[PDB]
Design a protein around this ligand. Structure first.
Ligand SMILES: *C[C@@](*)(O)[C@H](CCCNC(N)=[NH2+])NC(=O)[C@@H]1CCCN1C(=O)[C@H](N)Cc1ccccc1
Lengths: 5, 249, 26
């Protein structure tokens, strides 16, 4: 579920 | 972290996330010791039995984070590594003896409310605080159980006497390690767990009110089992090697 | 230098919720 940077 | 709680904002500003570029994945914890240097457990980089061997290029470091998964748009700093240094006598073959590594950041980070280095212990600070019964604090984004938290977790754990440590495992313990947790009788619990490695074990000095890193999350068998304890790399003991690399590079 | 002194706590003379637990153990 990592939000891009 | 098992049986911990959500950190408070700015509680552990030296806390760093070890992040894999692709697949994007939380690797481990780490800690900020200066504006250019990050401390972590060598087994987060190199662990051949599992085919793990990461390079500068394999990773990113995320600083000043709170949320595990969200991009903390004006708070966190993402940095690339310039150079990785592994303890030359790190023992991946038998017991994770000397489980420590330094990471040199490409460009220095700017310290903020959410970003600030922890102190490295001195011979004297180690001597007074590293005693059975004294509690330290562990933080991380690892497994909640022997799962992934949404925010950084914290737990306060007491140091345990060497002999108790020794009698809890079949693994050969060395002077570069210490164990911590509650005794089953004590009926209070909590521990680090997988994904927590490289995270700092910290103590607050009663003399000068400063936080010191005494340990690094290293290994355990299971997470929060009765009769078992978390094992940590003894920072003071590997101090000269740390000095030695920063003085050289 | 400034190490181990947290901008939102020590620096402002504010304590986090469980740091007393550590100092009580010493
Ligand atoms: C890297 C990590 O996140 C992790 C931390 C585990 C901490 N656990 C507790 N309960 N405090 N470390 C590991 O996974 C290490 C690296 C390789 C194996 N390992 C272990 O903890 C094993 N479970 C046991 C072990 C195997 C070999 C040598 C020493 C320990």
């Amino acid at each position: 579920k990592y939000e891009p940077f | 972290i098992v049986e911990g709680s959500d950190a408070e904002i700015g509680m552990s500003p030296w806390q760093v996330m070890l992040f894999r570029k692709s697949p994007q994945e939380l690797l481990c914890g780490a800690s900020l010791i200066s504006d250019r240097w990050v401390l972590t457990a060598a087994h987060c980089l190199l662990y051949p039995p599992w085919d793990k061997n990461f390079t500068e290029n394999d990773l990113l470091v995320r600083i000043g984070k709170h949320s595990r998964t969200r991009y903390e748009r004006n708070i966190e700093k993402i940095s690339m590594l310039e150079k990785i240094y592994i303890h030359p006598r790190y023992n991946w073959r038998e017991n994770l003896d000397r489980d420590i590594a330094l990471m040199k950041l490409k460009k220095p980070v700017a310290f903020s409310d959410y970003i600030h280095p922890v102190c490295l212990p001195d011979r004297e600070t180690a001597a007074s605080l590293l005693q059975a019964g004294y509690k330290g604090r562990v933080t991380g984004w690892g497994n909640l159980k022997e799962g992934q938290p949404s925010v950084l977790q914290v737990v306060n754990l007491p140091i345990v006497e060497r002999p108790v440590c020794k009698d809890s495992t079949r693994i050969r313990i060395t002077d570069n390690m210490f164990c911590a947790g509650y005794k089953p009788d004590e009926g209070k619990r909590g521990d680090a767990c997988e994904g927590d490695s490289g995270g700092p074990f910290v103590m607050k000095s009663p003399f000068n009110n400063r936080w010191y890193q005494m340990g690094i999350v290293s290994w355990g068998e299971g997470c929060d089992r009765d009769g078992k304890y978390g094992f940590y790399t003894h920072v003071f003991r590997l101090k000269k090697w740390i000095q030695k690399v920063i003085d050289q590079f | 230098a400034d190490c181990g002194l947290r901008p939102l706590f020590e620096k402002k003379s504010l304590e986090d919720k469980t740091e007393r637990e550590l100092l009580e153990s010493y």
